[PDB]
Write an enzyme that holds these catalytic residues in place. Structure first.
Site, PDB file in Angstrom:
ATOM      1  N   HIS A 259      -8.641  18.616  -9.231  1.00  0.00           N
ATOM      2  CA  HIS A 259      -8.310  19.859 -10.483  1.00  0.00           C
ATOM      3  C   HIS A 259      -6.557  19.686 -10.816  1.00  0.00           C
ATOM      4  CE1 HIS A 259     -11.787  21.430  -8.522  1.00  0.00           C
ATOM      5  NE2 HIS A 259     -10.874  21.619  -7.170  1.00  0.00           N
TER       6      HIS A 259
ATOM      7  N   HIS B 239      -0.632  22.401 -14.817  1.00  0.00           N
ATOM      8  CA  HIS B 239      -1.829  22.594 -15.721  1.00  0.00           C
ATOM      9  C   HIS B 239      -1.401  22.168 -17.001  1.00  0.00           C
ATOM     10  CE1 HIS B 239      -3.215  25.461 -12.961  1.00  0.00           C
ATOM     11  NE2 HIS B 239      -2.216  26.076 -13.056  1.00  0.00           N
TER      12      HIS B 239
ATOM     13  N   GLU C 262      -1.915  27.539 -19.414  1.00  0.00           N
ATOM     14  CA  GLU C 262      -2.333  28.982 -19.009  1.00  0.00           C
ATOM     15  C   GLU C 262      -1.948  29.813 -19.633  1.00  0.00           C
ATOM     16  OE1 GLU C 262      -3.240  28.437 -14.922  1.00  0.00           O
ATOM     17  OE2 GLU C 262      -5.491  27.512 -15.587  1.00  0.00           O
TER      18      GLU C 262
ATOM     19  N   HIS D 250       3.648  25.971 -12.173  1.00  0.00           N
ATOM     20  CA  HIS D 250       3.278  26.852 -11.436  1.00  0.00           C
ATOM     21  C   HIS D 250       4.376  26.514  -9.818  1.00  0.00           C
ATOM     22  CE1 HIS D 250      -0.111  28.228 -13.190  1.00  0.00           C
ATOM     23  NE2 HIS D 250       1.230  29.040 -14.047  1.00  0.00           N
TER      24      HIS D 250
ATOM     25  N   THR E  52      -8.140  29.741 -10.947  1.00  0.00           N
ATOM     26  CA  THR E  52      -8.973  29.166 -10.280  1.00  0.00           C
ATOM     27  C   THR E  52      -9.673  29.875  -9.699  1.00  0.00           C
ATOM     28  OG1 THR E  52      -7.741  28.040  -8.424  1.00  0.00           O
ATOM     29  CG2 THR E  52      -7.076  26.948 -10.065  1.00  0.00           C
TER      30      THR E  52
HETATM   31 ZN   LIG Z   1      -1.795  26.956 -11.124  1.00  0.00          ZN
END
Ligand SMILES: [Zn+2]
EC number: 4.2.1.1
Length: 257
Positions: free
Chosen positions: A61, A93, A103, A116, A196
């Site tokens: 991911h 991301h 995000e 993050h 997520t």
């Molecule tokens: Zn994240």
């Protein structure tokens, strides 16, 4: 399983993770004119001097840089937080194009990527118990724009060839996460969730106002990673971001006037 494609991406997550439609989901759009300056916030304290990175992992991911969190070696305190939160990992991301990938958004602006730094509240003893608590986690979010290269990012970019596919990991000791931070610690904060699955509502979000700049070449190396495992058909790891979710009954606070 879950992912970011048409058939298992964010519009489908609610069927296995019904909290996806809950009251404090993340990310959100940060409307800068509606955020309220809070003089009650105390200064943010980012104490990463003794951070001990261990490993970098492609989990299918994103990729995570993992830390030793068995002692208070790298912690976040102050700001909106009560107590001490310990760094366990960071990840990003990012988009298929420079115009998308973050995000959170700021007055609907999408950045090219978002960092993050994930921390858990030491009063709960470990990460797994922390994600059973409404104040279990603090995630420090930092936007990336494309422009000049970020020197402190280059060691991460250069190891990505060794973890191209899902389930690969590599040693990643002696990495200093302080080299990923912008000059200013001005921030926005709100109560939210993991972005997520399992989308758990445990996170105090702290989103820095000042983006860092990375080069085109650095983010292009992110986009050469793979969501798939070795030997499987190649699907580039791009657009691994969840779009903004309804703010509902929440107020975003600003640390700065
Ligand atoms: Zn994240």
């Amino acid at each position: 399983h879950w992912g970011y494609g048409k058939h298992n991406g964010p519009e489908h997550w609610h069927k296995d993770f019904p909290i996806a439609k809950g009251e404090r989901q993340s990310p959100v759009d940060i409307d800068t004119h509606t955020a309220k300056y809070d003089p009650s916030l105390k200064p943010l304290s980012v104490s990463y001097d003794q951070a001990t990175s261990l490993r970098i992992l492609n989990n299918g991911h994103a990729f995570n840089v993992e830390f030793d969190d068995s002692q208070d070696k790298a912690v976040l305190k102050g700001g909106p937080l009560d107590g001490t939160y310990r760094l366990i990992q960071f990840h990003f991301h990012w988009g298929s194009l420079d115009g998308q990938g973050s995000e959170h958004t700021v007055d609907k602006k999408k950045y090219a990527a978002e960092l993050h730094l994930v921390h858990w509240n030491t009063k709960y003893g470990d990460f797994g118990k922390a994600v059973q608590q409404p104040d279990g986690l603090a995630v420090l979010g930092i936007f990336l724009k494309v422009g000049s290269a970020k020197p402190g990012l280059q060691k991460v970019v250069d190891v990505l060839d060794s973890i191209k596919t899902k389930g690969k990991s590599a040693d990643f000791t002696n990495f200093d996460p302080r080299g990923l931070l912008p000059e200013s610690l001005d921030y926005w904060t709100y109560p939210g969730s993991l972005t997520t699955p399992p989308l758990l509502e445990c996170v105090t979000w702290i989103v820095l106002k000042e983006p860092i700049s990375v080069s085109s070449e650095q983010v292009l190396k992110f986009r050469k990673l793979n969501f798939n495992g070795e030997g499987e058909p190649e699907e580039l790891m791009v657009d691994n971001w969840r779009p903004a979710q309804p703010l509902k009954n929440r107020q975003i606070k600003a640390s700065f006037k």
